[PDB]
DNA sequence: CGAACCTGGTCTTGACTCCATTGCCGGATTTGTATTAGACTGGCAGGGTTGCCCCGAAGCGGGCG
């Protein structure tokens, strides 16, 4: 389980993210899931920073780092002839 | 016509001074590797549609008897 989790931390993302940032991102996701099931709504980021013993700007930095990239090979418009990369100035 | 002066770039020197360039050192943070001893031991997209090409039974006609 150690080697499988380490390989999932290494190779499962497009841009590479180190192990401790992956750990705190998964911690943030688990705590947000628990607070969503408990409170019933989406938690405030200051409440998340209160829960995770860190600062809300660090919470915002982690939420910025967690954003996976989107692909350029889908169809934006109704017709499939228009790919996504043909509307980027 | 001769002397004194004003002001033109022209150029040196002495002093100031100011800010980049390393450089060291101490600490903070950031990333990478090793380690956790009860037992645990073979999964899941997925099919459906359309069209065309390649091999097998089968008449079957010609060689065979």
Swiss-Prot record:
It comes from the Bacteria. It is found in: Cytoplasm. Residues 23-89 are annotated as: Sigma-70 factor domain-3. Sigma factors are initiation factors that promote the attachment of RNA polymerase to specific initiation sites and are then released. This sigma factor is the primary sigma factor during exponential growth. Interacts transiently with the RNA polymerase catalytic core formed by RpoA, RpoB, RpoC and RpoZ (2 alpha, 1 beta, 1 beta' and 1 omega subunit) to form the RNA polymerase holoenzyme that can initiate transcription. The sigma-70 factor domain-2 mediates sequence-specific interaction with the -10 element in promoter DNA, and plays an important role in melting the double-stranded DNA and the formation of the transcription bubble. The sigma-70 factor domain-2 mediates interaction with the RNA polymerase subunits RpoB and RpoC. Belongs to the sigma-70 factor family. RpoD/SigA subfamily. This is RNA polymerase sigma factor SigA. It comes from Mycobacterium tuberculosis (strain CDC 1551 / Oshkosh). The chain holds residues 352 to 440 of 528 of the full protein.
């Amino acid at each position: 389980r150690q080697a499988i989790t380490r390989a999932m931390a290494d190779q499962a993302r497009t841009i590479r993210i180190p192990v401790h940032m992956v750990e705190v991102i998964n911690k943030l996701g688990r705590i947000q899931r628990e607070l969503l099931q408990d409170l019933g709504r989406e938690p405030t980021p200051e409440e998340l920073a209160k829960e995770m013993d860190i600062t809300p700007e660090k919470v915002l930095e982690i939420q910025q780092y967690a954003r996976e990239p989107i692909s350029l090979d889908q169809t934006i418009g109704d017709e499939g002839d228009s790919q996504l990369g043909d509307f980027i100035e």
